[PDB]
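Loading example: each entry is read as two labelled lines plus one structure line.
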Amino acid sequence: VEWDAFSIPELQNFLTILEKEEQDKIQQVQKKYDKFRQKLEEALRE
Amino acid sequence: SWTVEDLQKRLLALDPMMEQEIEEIRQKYQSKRQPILDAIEAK
């Protein structure tokens, strides 16, 4: 991708898009660990 | 009794593992935004 072909506002928008994708990805991850944790906390509390 | 310790060890492993995945994610996404930042700065 030749990013220089895009205008400043287009490039800014791509950054906003990537920022939103990165947060979503981090959310997926926090959620995955939260489910591991609940199963663990159940076994422990027993 | 081994079990409770092992379970306990896994629980205490979660956040450190999770923070390490997240770090991997941020580096990945920084890598993806870097050539965009460069194009912005080179204009």
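Chain B touches chain A at residues 3-4, 7-8, 10-11, 14-15, 17-18, 21-22, 25-26, 29, 32-33, 35-40, 42-43 (CB under 8 Å).
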